[PDB]
Amino acid sequence: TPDLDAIVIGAGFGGIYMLHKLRNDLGLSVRVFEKGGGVGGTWYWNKYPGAKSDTEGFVYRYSFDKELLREYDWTTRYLDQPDVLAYLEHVVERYDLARDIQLNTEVTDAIFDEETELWRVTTAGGETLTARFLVTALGLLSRSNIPDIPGRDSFAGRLVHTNAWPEDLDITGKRVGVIGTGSTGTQFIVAAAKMAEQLTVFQRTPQYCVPSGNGPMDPDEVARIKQNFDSIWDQVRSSTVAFGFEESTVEAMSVSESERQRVFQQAWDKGNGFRFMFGTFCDIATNPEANAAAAAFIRSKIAEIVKDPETARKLTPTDLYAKRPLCNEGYYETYNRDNVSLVSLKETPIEEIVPQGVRTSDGVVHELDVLVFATGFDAVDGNYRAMNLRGRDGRHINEHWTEGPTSYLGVTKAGFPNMFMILGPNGPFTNTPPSIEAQVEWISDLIDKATREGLTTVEPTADAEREWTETCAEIANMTLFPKADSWIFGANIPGKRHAVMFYLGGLGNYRRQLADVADGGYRGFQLRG
Amino acid sequence: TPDLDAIVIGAGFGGIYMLHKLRNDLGLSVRVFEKGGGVGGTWYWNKYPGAKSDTEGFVYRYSFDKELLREYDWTTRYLDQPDVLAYLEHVVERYDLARDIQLNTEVTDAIFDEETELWRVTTAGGETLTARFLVTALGLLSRSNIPDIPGRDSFAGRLVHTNAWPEDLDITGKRVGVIGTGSTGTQFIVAAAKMAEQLTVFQRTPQYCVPSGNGPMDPDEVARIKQNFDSIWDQVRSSTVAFGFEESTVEAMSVSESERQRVFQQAWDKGNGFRFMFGTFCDIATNPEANAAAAAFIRSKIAEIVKDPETARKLTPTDLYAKRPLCNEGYYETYNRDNVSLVSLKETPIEEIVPQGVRTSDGVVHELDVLVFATGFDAVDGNYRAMNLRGRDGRHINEHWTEGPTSYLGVTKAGFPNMFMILGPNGPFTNTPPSIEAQVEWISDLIDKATREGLTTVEPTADAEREWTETCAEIANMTLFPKADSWIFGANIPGKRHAVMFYLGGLGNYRRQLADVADGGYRGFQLRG
Ligand SMILES: Cc1cc2nc3c(=O)[nH]c(=O)nc-3n(C[C@H](O)[C@H](O)[C@H](O)COP(=O)(O)OP(=O)(O)OC[C@H]3O[C@@H](n4cnc5c(N)ncnc54)[C@H](O)[C@@H]3O)c2cc1C
């Protein structure tokens, strides 16, 4: 007889809804552990200026509670970090979840006991409890990447990763430097150029950024949206990427040069990274002719905007448009400002970080009061491998993830009975809240089943999992996504395996795969009583 | 009994070698019908300034006569049109072939009479003759495409297609205009910019041109090449594209950026269109990420050379590097001259041709003395589809080619008994002479076999042909070539079917496939005593 029915790890979007479901709806006893000092997860950690959603606010939220969709307000098209935080803090005070969420508690070890068939969770602070069910909502983009750059630790000013932005730091009138030009880096670069006396951008790989289309929301348009929320969420759940725009059905090279130029320009004026890739034509990520047309359109726009053509040439990427889409309000325009200088790490690689700044290969000491690490995450498996996470035959999860990280259906693991993952390996690549919802609801159903039927263990088969890798491998190889050398296939981090880490079939097909398995008596599961 | 054993149509490289093989080597009665007034096909028609090979002279010749290799000399690395026409004139002289090449004579009707089992062939000149074997060497690029641009024929000065260049025209000190920036257009533009008082180029689609590396040959090097000709042709016949360079075996993205940059720079300084696509890395035409790296290198070379950054942008293409590789001596450089100007039909299309010049959408009248259409050909199936060519059940060859043009082994057609094609549909995409040699010799053997064994019909099965189409389709769709929109898939002429028309497995595999069919008792052929 364990201490709790269930233990959830992480207080991000994932963990929060998982607790609400297991305790309020299933009536079970639950506790959540979160290493951070606050609920909110990603929207707790990333306090950096510019930090905001690249999903539009209207569908970057929960949907399960129709009363909360009516009530809660948003003033801007994209949600700033503080606003996404207040939203989640409100969700916590609403379902009365705060009392069962223990903060400032990292989970160091989680061991499955083959004999008692319970999980024992072990904390940083050297406490343990037991639960029948473990749920790991650790986050795809939770565990900080800070590369071992020669001299890093010598830097005498403030050095921080964006995922540990201090509440207290004010870059106003300081010399700021940033390493990274992904979603985080770019959206910091905008907000930062407005603040810093001078901003140096350390860019190794330029990316195909499009406009966000950000600005205020008419309170009338918010009202109209709330009226038609039932309908918006039905469209979101049937889409692939679930960003709340209608996805194009049209092959990009099935129409004239003029039409292809008009469609891309329309998407450009409207804004959104995911609209540009999927809202324009159906085959930008699958067909290379189509991918070149879209990249070409963005290359041409960078030249129009970026005045100094040198700065244009450095900002212009030449590789496949197959990284996750970026959007910002005025990224390229930012580089027309006289306090912003662009250092291409292709051409002038960082030799060493000194106390005083950053020395590049050309011999220039770039003096900085503040060095920002916009260098992304150990994505997907990060906080799993760094847990002492032990299932059947006393084996660590690492032993299973030799040829890359794996799962059955994105939510369960072979030889890890009663362990569910929110956004585990080989799950959906989408707007994250409705993918979380599909997973948190599917997991709640399976647990509730075990409770009612008195099942001691639920666990997928080695076969099911192997079969699910092959399904994800088939889908991923039909896309241009594997050939983009970014975090999505784990090529971003020295000595990490270039492996498939996502089901790229979309929320529509993913929800259908969950539904089919559940209706089919939980196909590929072993249910012991 | 027929008038002739065999009729050959066309007197280019194709027809000339076929006639040698059938008459000199097999003693048969044979006549050639060339609709042009001289031998040489492509090299008779294309009389324009700058008209030269883009395969290096050393292997843009016949290989069957080891003596003719030792003797005939070449002074330049690439052969000018007069020099290739002089070469085929020497071949015609050498084997006493002129007396069986009837010139100015266009065949309009090719009818298989199933009762007599002979070919009846009608000229425009009003002769009909019967033959046992018909060999159609009509050429992949013999039928001029002259787009119906509004008000074409209203033009006061001299209008010609490049394939219809008249021997009389001197463009020296004249305002010259040209439409098309293909292999023909570009090599014209180079030679023309020297001669014309002013050259206006009407470019719809810029292409990825590399340096030729053309110049004098060291007469020592010509003799050294001759020494090792046995050895060179062996590499040519075992290669894929057969341009006389060692094809690479290195996947482009399996090595550093630094290494990738050296390899492309190496191939640039050495030169050649096909060297840059296949001499650099093994997956430039198959792997989109490799293709990007290749295209990106050329885009940055157009930036270095083209001083006027406006011109450079218009010259810089953005589609896939998946058209037939172009190379020239100093193509991009040519635009640095004062007497040359680029008009992008993407931005300012032709509204109308007028007596004086050419009016673009911007309302500018481009005053011209000479208009040159470098607008290419009805490729592969041009002079077939335009012929009254009926086989079994009286069917026209267009009933066969509704979903695109077809063949068995590139050299025969289902329902067309005793018809053979030199570079028929679904044939090799290679340096042309050694592909013609593979086919002319394979055809001589099968015709020789029919003569000895007293066969009345040789003929592929619908199945065999349908199997070949599937083989050709499986090989193509595994490349970037289909997503090009050039002449190689009939997508150059409005209305014509976007179809496969080439085996892209290379000379090596094509020769192996001919050999395999022959040695296996002509697999998929019906032989009738
Ligand atoms: C600036 C920014 C903007 C984004 N915008 C979007 C967007 O617009 N659309 C979109 O789809 N996605 C977006 N994302 C991705 C984002 O990660 C998800 O939208 C979502 O926040 C993930 O929620 P989660 O609960 O799955 O993970 P997280 O929010 O990362 O929650 C994981 C939590 O678990 C904790 N944890 C991990 N390991 C342990 C352990 N061993 N013990 C205890 N606690 C642990 C972590 O500290 C963290 O608090 C954005 C991310 C960032 C950084």
Ligand SMILES: Cc1cc2nc3c(=O)[nH]c(=O)nc-3n(C[C@H](O)[C@H](O)[C@H](O)COP(=O)(O)OP(=O)(O)OC[C@H]3O[C@@H](n4cnc5c(N)ncnc54)[C@H](O)[C@@H]3O)c2cc1C
């Ligand atoms: C390295 C290389 C360089 C090349 N350079 C060029 C170049 O600079 N310019 C260029 O244009 N091509 C060029 N080509 C393509 C060229 O067409 C081939 O290399 C080759 O010369 C074609 O020979 P052929 O006998 O197959 O066809 P062709 O030489 O075209 O001969 C076909 C002949 O058939 C005749 N014919 C067609 N229909 C009929 C009919 N109904 N009745 C009677 N006669 C008919 C035509 O009039 C023509 O004379 C090049 C190819 C390679 C490999």
Ligand code: NA
């Ligand atoms: Na969508």
